Curated annotation (Swiss-Prot):
Functional description taken from the UniProt entry: Taste-modifying protein; intensely sweet-tasting. It is 100000 times sweeter than sucrose on a molar basis.
Superkingdom, natural source: Eukaryota
Family per similarity comment: Belongs to the thaumatin family.
Predominant cellular place of this UniProt entry's protein: cytoplasm
CDD domains: TLP-P
Annotated disulfide bonds: 9-204, 56-66, 71-77, 121-193, 126-177, 134-145, 149-158, 159-164
Classification via InterPro entries: Osmotin/thaumatin-like_sf, Thaumatin, Thaumatin_CS
Listed PROSITE patterns: THAUMATIN_1, THAUMATIN_2
Keywords associated with the record: Cytoplasmic vesicle, Disulfide bond, Signal, Taste-modifying protein
Subcellular localization: Cytoplasmic vesicle
Alphabetized Pfam families for the sequence: Thaumatin
Source species of the chain: Thaumatococcus daniellii
Name the UniProt record assigns to this protein: Thaumatin I
Length: 207
């Protein structure tokens, strides 16, 4: 499957793509404002994620630090990134179907649109100003808006027992972005697409 990753933000982001134990394609790349990066993701990939990282410094060996989404200090991510990270999530060719979603379960750093470039399903978007509106206790100094599990580490926020309800904090993410997961047991906003669809992830889709 082909993913075009487009940075429409006015600032540079460092895109990342991983399935948790391995990079997807190169795993990460700088995207200046306007730049597009096309990656190929193997069919049948389960649990892939794409996200943006902000305010990164890397040396010539690809080692460094980012203020949001850092994946162990590497330009080319092999693992998932440190919250807060708006997440494009996908499982491909699962019994003939692709499944995509946007998740705020690990917080929010960059607005995002996640849309198919082929026919047969709708896209999803979380483009509200969540950082600007972020509750005081969830604000991340590096930028972005943390989820409550990351901040407070309770069974309720993290849904550790498999039973949990919405919270004041999850309802904040849900109010601004209804089409993104706001907590683990949120009513699913997953979109079902034809197997082997292709996609575009756009950072800062509106502004």
């Amino acid at each position: 499957a082909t993913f075009e990753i487009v940075n429409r933000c006015s600032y540079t982001v460092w895109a990342a793509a991983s399935k948790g134990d391995a990079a997807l394609d190169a795993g990460g790349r700088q995207l200046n404002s306007g730049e597009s990066w096309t990656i190929n993701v193997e069919p049948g990939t389960n649990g892939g994620k794409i996200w943006a990282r902000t305010d990164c410094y890397f040396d010539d060996s690809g080692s460094g630090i980012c203020k949001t989404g850092d994946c162990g200090g590497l330009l080319r991510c092999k693992r998932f990134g440190r919250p807060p990270t708006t997440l494009a999530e996908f499982s491909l060719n699962q019994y003939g179907k692709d499944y995509i979603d946007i998740s705020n379960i690990k917080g929010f750093n960059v607005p995002m649109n996640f849309s198919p470039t082929t026919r047969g399903c709708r896209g999803v978007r979380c483009a509200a100003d969540i950082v600007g509106q972020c509750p005081a206790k969830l604000k991340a100094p590096g930028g972005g808006c943390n989820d409550a599990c990351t901040v407070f580490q309770t069974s309720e926020y993290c849904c550790t027992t498999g039973k949990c309800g919405p919270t004041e904090y999850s309802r904040f993410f849900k109010r601004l972005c209804p089409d993104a997961f706001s907590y683990v047991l949120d009513k699913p906003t997953t979109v079902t697409c034809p197997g082997s669809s292709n996609y575009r992830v756009t950072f800062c889709p509106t502004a």
